[PDB]
């Protein structure tokens, strides 16, 4: 809340979770098992997101954005692997599939979008933090809501910091900011669609039951 934007990035980068390793029924077992272990790291990552521990609310924000955060992480990992999705270093899958064949394409499309935009890691950690604080902010009390917006504004400044320190003109900064945040709308879409098909440890169902 009182961190320089350089210190903002450094905090988020340092708080990054590791990249974990891992027919039709077997592959879902792999993804389910992988996501379940990722959720454990995400929760402790969320605690290291500036302002998150200043809330109660934490359960609700995670319950709404967990699949989003998982998906943007996946998309980020698959950025330098065109046509494929890198779920894990030992699990790189392309289009070659029941029903999530559409989700794959949306993830590939999102990953392709990150590629041409040349998304930076410093920008990625900012977006992922935004998803955490934003996705469940209008489902709440309002005393914390005011503070969340202040943190969101701080991350916005941090994003603009990075672009300005990249040589981009003032207009290019606004445009790239818009382009980035508009992608979060698609991630919400993929999450909701993905959440639909999901309807398997106790934690993964506690998150899954929240979107019933």
């Amino acid at each position: 809340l009182s961190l320089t934007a350089d210190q903002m990035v450094s905090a988020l980068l340092d708080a990054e979770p590791p990249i974990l390793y891992s027919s039709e029924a077997s592959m879902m077992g792999l993804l389910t098992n992988l996501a379940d272990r990722e959720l454990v790291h995400m929760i402790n990552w969320a605690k290291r997101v500036p302002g998150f521990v200043d809330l109660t609310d934490q359960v609700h924000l995670l319950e709404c954005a967990w699949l989003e955060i998982l998906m943007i992480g996946l998309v980020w990992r698959s950025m330098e692997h065109p046509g494929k999705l890198l779920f894990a270093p030992n699990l790189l899958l392309d289009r070659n599939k029941e029903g999530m064949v559409e989700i794959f394409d949306m993830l590939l499309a999102t990953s392709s979008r990150f590629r041409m935009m040349n998304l930076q890691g410093e920008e990625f950690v900012c977006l992922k933090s935004i998803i955490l604080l934003n996705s469940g902010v209008y489902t709440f009390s309002l005393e914390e809501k005011d503070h969340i917006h202040r943190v969101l504004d701080k991350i916005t400044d941090t994003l603009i910091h990075l672009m300005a320190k990249a040589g981009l003109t003032l207009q290019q900064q606004h445009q790239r900011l818009a382009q980035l945040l508009l992608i979060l709308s698609h991630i919400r879409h993929m999450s909701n669609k993905g959440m639909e098909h999901l309807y398997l440890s106790d934690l993964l169902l506690e998150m899954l039951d929240a979107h019933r």
Partner: peptide
């Protein structure tokens, strides 16, 4: 709820 305990 599981998420409560782990967060604490």
């Amino acid at each position: 709820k599981i998420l409560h305990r782990l967060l604490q």
